[PDB]
């Protein structure tokens, strides 16, 4: 195995080696004793990191084996174990674990490794404390990333957990299920050093995975560090940031990563976290921060399905409206959004939040007092966005923005119950988003952009974007008439002939659609089939 | 002491280092030895004023690292500065006579502000050294441990904070090599130097060649005792 450092192939052998050390009892222990001695000698090899790991692993196991005292009494702990293990840590035994874990016969590997990971907690705690204390003292109040990372062995361990456990909830549950891991978590919660603290937050996020695990993580902070302390930290940072006008980004990014993970996988609890991080998160968003996008993503997680959207909409409108001066024209409104949502992350976050809020509802006469009211200006903003999208950098990025946009557009189409008409209403008809949505769609890069999604089709994620493109076109055809007659007159800039020539004339889209009926995804095929009917 | 406190704030002495800062604190320090006087100073809010003055910006706990026991930079505050914090460190030990949470986080807060020193002191006992460095570490070791015992104050009634870890290992390396240490160690005070020349072997107790290293030995030795627990 030594005669491999990078070679991924090493992973194949880890199951055998992890389990082998696990079953040291089998060996004799004349043999085990000999290996132990040989390994201490073997500390000569820094170049082979993976030797260093495996040996360290053996030690983690050996300690347990020495439990039958014939062996243990014989040995002196400081010489026999701690000195060597410490040497291994120094020689990057944790780092390579992290690598094994990060770069994840799965059953054998997962089982054997999780046994490894756990052995380290229970048997090793002396080492953890030794390292933690070592780290706290070492740095002194221009540190380079390399200097920060040198001593970081404890944090690396936390990451080891994060990578290994992630997904896998199964494994993750072990932490939460009984109240030593649970001790481990409590212990980790205690480590105050900003870097340890941030990795602790990240590790827990990984642990939060199941709907079930997420629930425990909720309780962990709430009941037996509290959520309140967390928001407090965010609040404090906010003040420091603004009063002032990397370390913080690490901490904050972690704070958000964690809140996001749980809020997403939760239920009625969501409201509780919502009311509490919502107010604080809103305040943080006002500050520039690199981060803006991230809080928007978290905010979105908080947004509830029901009526009680209102606090969120106000925050958003207020948070676009506040600085901007709006003339009585449209452009000034666009400017408000453009000024605030300066960078790419800001926009993507914004889109996710908006997608969520627009899902099914918002307040009447929104923006009243400050500006011409209503939802319409937000859709105009998208002109800035998906108009632009075509000229992304970075396909992955373009797709990232395009998708939220399609989902929003589709939602707005569903947003009005067309059926009521075919088989203060006026005001309601004015307020719904379906109106501005149709207006923009008719604006022929708008139609084109939607159309190109169809022309160029097929990772799986991209496939979804395609389905949405079709579904939207179908929806438009079905109710194109409704908009022109009923909706447009009420609420009575301009009209239709443009999309048709382009869809109908322009042929490639028609042919592409034809090809789609066959290709399995029923959503794409069934919809493609419907469209041609609508076009004809 | 009220004037002494004011002088501390006043002590920039821009001509070079802050003579007055150290002098005032030392005067307070001598007074601080009296336990009763110590309480008054805290009531006075000496700890409050110590963090607040202009000097606080200067410390290498807040600024850079130029302050060091061996620093060439001298609008002489740089080496004088560790002297003020470090020598005047003893103030906090003495104030502790209060024995209960009242000013413990105040004193502790003081230390909290000077993070750069907490890191530096510990690093300082990396292999480069002065006798003074040993005392500073010894001093901090006492505060944290005591503060920690008090940390076991809980609110095991109330709140506390600070950092223990790197120093112990550093100390051991120094103890083992007396030879390296004597060469390595340098006197910095006129008072320190004669003891360097002088010799107090003792085989009443022997462990060192010189007078100076014995003192050096004594300080780091105690530090190990407290930390070991």
Write structural notes for this entry.
It is classed as transport protein. The structure is cut from a larger assembly and holds chains A (536 residues) and B (229 residues). Chain A has 536 residues and is mainly α. Chain A has helices at 10-22, 30-41, 49-65, 69-74, 77-90, 93-102, 106-123, 125-138, 145-150, 153-165, 173-176, 181-190, 194-207, 211-222, 227-244, 247-264, 269-274, 277-286, 292-302, 310-318, 330-340, 344-358, 376-385, 395-414, 418-422, 425-430, 434-442, 446-455, 460-489, 500-503, 507-518, 522-535. The longest helix of chain A is centred in the C-terminal third of the chain and has 30 residues, at 460-489. Chain B is mainly α and 229 residues long. Chain B contains 14 helices and 2 strands. Chain B has a two-stranded parallel ribbon. The A-B interface holds A 132-141, 192 and B 61, 65, 114-123, 161, 163-167, 169.
Considering the chains and any ligands shown, give keywords for the structure:
part of a larger assembly; 2 chains; A: 536 residues; mainly alpha; 0% strand; elongated; B: 229 residues; two-stranded parallel ribbon; 14 helices; 2 strands; 62% helix; globular; transport protein
Topology:
This is part of a larger assembly, with chains A (536 residues) and B (229 residues).
Chain A lengths: L9 H13 L7 H12 L7 H17 L3 H6 L2 H14 L2 H10 L3 H18 L1 H14 L6 H6 L2 H13 L7 H4 L4 H10 L3 H14 L3 H12 L4 H18 L2 H18 L4 H6 L2 H10 L5 H11 L7 H9 L11 H11 L3 H15 L17 H10 L9 H20 L3 H5 L2 H6 L3 H9 L3 H10 L4 H30 L10 H4 L3 H12 L3 H14 L1
Chain B lengths: L1 H9 L8 H14 L2 H10 L1 H6 L3 H4 L18 H11 L2 H6 L8 H10 L1 H10 L4 E2 H21 L15 H10 L1 H7 E2 L5 H6 L13 H18 L1
Parallel strand pairs in B: 1-2
